[PDB]
Design an enzyme around this catalytic site. Structure first.
Site, PDB file in Angstrom:
ATOM      1  N   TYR A  37       1.401  -1.144  -0.379  1.00 52.46           N
ATOM      2  CA  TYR A  37       0.007   0.305  -0.023  1.00 52.46           C
ATOM      3  C   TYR A  37       0.994   1.344   0.068  1.00 52.46           C
ATOM      4  O   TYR A  37       0.783   1.943  -0.582  1.00 52.46           O
ATOM      5  CB  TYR A  37      -0.798   0.136   1.089  1.00 52.46           C
ATOM      6  CG  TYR A  37      -2.109   1.193   1.127  1.00 52.46           C
ATOM      7  CD1 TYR A  37      -2.832   0.897   0.528  1.00 52.46           C
ATOM      8  CD2 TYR A  37      -1.660   2.260   2.237  1.00 52.46           C
ATOM      9  CE1 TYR A  37      -4.091   2.258   0.805  1.00 52.46           C
ATOM     10  CE2 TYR A  37      -2.903   3.246   2.086  1.00 52.46           C
ATOM     11  CZ  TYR A  37      -4.098   3.323   1.415  1.00 52.46           C
ATOM     12  OH  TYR A  37      -4.500   4.279   1.209  1.00 52.46           O
ATOM     13  N   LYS A  42       0.883   4.378  -2.985  1.00 50.33           N
ATOM     14  CA  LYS A  42       0.560   5.905  -2.855  1.00 50.33           C
ATOM     15  C   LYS A  42       1.821   6.759  -2.966  1.00 50.33           C
ATOM     16  O   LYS A  42       2.025   7.740  -2.859  1.00 50.33           O
ATOM     17  CB  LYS A  42       0.452   5.683  -1.188  1.00 50.33           C
ATOM     18  CG  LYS A  42      -1.149   4.826  -1.231  1.00 50.33           C
ATOM     19  CD  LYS A  42      -2.211   5.351  -2.177  1.00 50.33           C
ATOM     20  CE  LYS A  42      -3.707   5.417  -1.653  1.00 50.33           C
ATOM     21  NZ  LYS A  42      -4.861   5.719  -2.761  1.00 50.33           N
TER      22      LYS A  42
END
Lengths: 245, 237, 245, 237
Positions: free
Chosen positions: B149, B153
């Protein structure tokens, strides 16, 4: 909310910030260093745009007692103070090896230590109401560190660390503290510069366009919103893509 | 104004759609699976002042779906000048236990799919010489709290800066923006530990992230591009 | 310590990193994509500079099972593995609006997902010995976001966030994870570029000089030191002043 | 090699001097008040291989003292090619209780004094067309934990980047670098709270910060300039 003190609000970015918040119905203390007549000009225009209470206040922020007094003067003249925009700043550009003690001291004093003084006094008032908005106008060069003005860069980078520290120290007391970092903004003063200087500046900007003072003010108006309550400790660059932030 | 908002059936995406509805934007409300929830949002957006709302189902894990989605949105709205890449997925686990598939899915949905949507949008914006793209990234792309993740990002922040600089003279801007969402579903002990880290000592509200998106998509933000704004109560330096 | 795997070590920065660590007595697995003969050349030179065990390993990191196998192959050939330098990377430069799904996918795969795979496998081995050094070779453009290669920028920025996450997740297990961000480094490959390209790159650099691959390797050798144990999660730019970091 | 290290009588400064002693640097050991402790460091540096060590007392709160210090060091060493601005003071307190004097002292010693030392050094380096300047800044200049000290250290990072870019083509580099020092003096409850924030779960050692300084002052670091390296166990993003 309803009060603000804007430093260096007689021209350029400070004026645009003043006029922008007038459009939002803010009461305004328009601070100025020297040019009083110009400050009065801005006050009249702020009135014409919708400000219900406007006062001009003259202070030399190089004088330690001046910056401390300014916040209390502003609070008195406005009937309170919930917003502070530290926009005022000076330059004394020179190469490091030719930079005099006084050229350094003046720039750090006016651009950082004076902002200490105003911020400390404003927070004391804001803490009691459990609401406040503080915005520091730094400069992208505080991040980028372009040569020729190491004094100015130190002052603006210090202003950023300062913004983060005060943000963290006062965040559960309903106060936000943020910075707006203008890129290259065209004003009456920058237009005075040699053509060669303008083109070299302009060359660095992805958007291929100087910013307008009004654009910096839009960002300021956004952060001092009640609606911007969860934004604090941040530096927002208004620079046409210049800074990797 | 005509905006495509990804993952707009709930939480932050839903808040962004409803907030843009209040500015009178026409809206394409994208959802992955829960169509009914997307219709409910679409109903509320109409009620708040959006003159044209349409819902669009696409599984952004399918490459042709991301690409088609922008074209579908433009067709239903009659053009497209705004894209809000909000949709995102997590497959949380320690690195040493992280299967290839769980890395790939998160990178796909959160980064590669955003590549494809942004590519398609810029084509259309760059004809009109006007556009607004806002990537909803997460503070963890900066902080790197304990990896798929975070990589996605952080990559999204890089991608924002790259695309900003590439289209800066075409009247298009590209920017990136602990919130109370499904986060309320978490154990009380997890929430309280997050709260102690937040200087403001409270979680954010979806509407607060939406307010930053509305500012950046405004013509009042025309000289802001390539930037990442944290809405985080003082969490990230 | 005593083992390392260096990816893309047959030329340029990877080769310099390989040769630099050989000078420190490291055992080395020299990974290469295609040019095996060049990889063998580097292995011989690493031997001549003081490496006590050198092996060449060929893998196409675009193949998912290749990157996973590589670490275990390296560990086998070296008798263990305590160091991983993820240097390998590819470009597929194009404007965003002309960028094909495959041009994006190849670059993210080789530059980020493959590095996932190698990092995950290396950490599993390092966790058991309670020591490891992982260095990812990113690029300053991962921070700066220069146009023309949005795929490459996303991959390198992702590699930075990745470096920080793994650093934090493994810091109490004796493993450090850091990134080195080369600026504009002159190699055989960059010299192939048109003159016009070189001058525009060169123009951006305060030091007014391309870096040498050997300079990037010095930074790498510093971070993989046992003496660099309290440095983790960091990105060190080797770029002649280009990046404000 | 000839280096001036500020605040070198104890902790990190002392570690930097002793580490540079091992590379055979001639050293000017600056101290504010505790001369004897500076002599002890100077004795240990000789024993570790420094061919010429001198101690220099200067109160960096006096403007003429910072300026004179570089000239004194150059005179005693026979030149000066390295400057390590390590000396720093704190006057910790809440902003709302922070007196003008306590702001001014910290800014003076930590930033303005560094301005003056660096100014004097670059003059000398720029004659020889070679120099190394390393500013010892603190992670709190980035993190901004709860303001005088943080402002000073953030300003020092800005100043590092500015001076780097200004002297980059003159063969001079300018870079910036929870440690076990007098930190051991702190209440056990304060230390343990710091430790929980550090991913590595241990305080750093002065010698570890010194190793980074030695690398940056090396000719092996000639293409590194304008950079800030954290030595912090993963603390700062």
């Amino acid at each position: 909310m309803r009060k603000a003190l804007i430093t260096g609000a007689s021209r350029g970015i400070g004026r645009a910030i003043a006029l922008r918040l007038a459009e939002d119905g803010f009461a305004l203390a328009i601070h100025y260093g020297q040019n009083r007549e110009k400050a009065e000009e801005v006050a009249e225009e702020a009135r014409r745009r919708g400000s219900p209470l406007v006062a001009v206040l003259g202070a030399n922020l190089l004088e330690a007692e001046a910056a401390t007094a300014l916040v209390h003067q502003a609070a008195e003249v406005l009937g309170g103070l919930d917003t502070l925009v530290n926009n005022a700043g000076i330059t004394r550009d020179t190469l490091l090896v030719r930079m005099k003690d006084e050229d350094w001291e003046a720039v750090l004093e006016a651009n950082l230590s004076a902002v200490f003084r105003t911020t400390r006094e404003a927070v004391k008032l804001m803490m009691k109401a459990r609401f406040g908005r503080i915005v520091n106008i730094t400069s992208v060069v505080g991040i980028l560190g372009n040569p020729g003005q190491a004094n100015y860069v130190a002052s603006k980078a210090g202003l950023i660390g300062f913004t983060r520290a005060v943000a963290k120290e006062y965040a559960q007391r309903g106060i936000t503290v943020n910075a707006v970092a203008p890129g290259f903004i065209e004003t009456e003063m920058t237009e005075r510069l040699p053509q060669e200087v303008k083109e070299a500046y302009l060359k660095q900007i992805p958007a291929g366009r100087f910013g307008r003072p009004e654009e910096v003010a839009e960002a300021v108006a956004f952060l001092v919103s009640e609606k911007a309550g969860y934004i604090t400790g941040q530096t927002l660059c208004v620079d046409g893509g210049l800074t990797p932030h």
